[PDB]
């Protein structure tokens, strides 16, 4: 029984910032590790950013290695992606994704390795 919600999307300039969040409500006591994907126009959906269970370790794929930061806190159950240097290629809709079993050596990449998702938010980037 666990729930995502994401948030955080909407319009920004190119050049700019935005955060998106995901909360999670499990009464377990398990801290999920979390996932954000993305869906470009026209473009498969794909990994973006991972993170475990305590943040120790995380993973972004493309140029979210450079732009982006994926963290998280564990005092309200809630991850967060923080996108720089916003451009029109990462409009999208975003997602974010949940399993209970954390990683260290090697990251959860498949969509298939995360049965929670949230509903998508979408971003618009516009010059
Ligand atoms: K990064």
């Known amino acids: 029984d666990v729930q995502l919600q994401a948030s955080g999307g909407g319009s920004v300039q190119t050049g700019g910032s935005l955060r998106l969040s995901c909360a999670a409500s499990g009464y377990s006591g398990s801290r999920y590790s979390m996932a954000w994907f993305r869906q470009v126009p026209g473009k498969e959906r794909e990994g973006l950013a991972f993170?475990?269970?305590?943040?120790?370790?995380?993973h972004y794929e493309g140029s979210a290695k450079d732009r982006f930061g994926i963290s998280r806190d564990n005092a309200q159950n809630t991850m967060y992606l923080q996108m720089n240097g916003l451009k029109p290629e990462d409009t999208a809709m975003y997602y974010c994704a949940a399993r209970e079993s954390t990683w260290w050596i090697t990251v959860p990449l498949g969509e298939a390795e995360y049965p929670y998702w949230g509903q998508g938010t979408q971003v618009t980037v516009s010059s």
């Open positions: 993170i475990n269970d305590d943040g120790s370790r995380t």
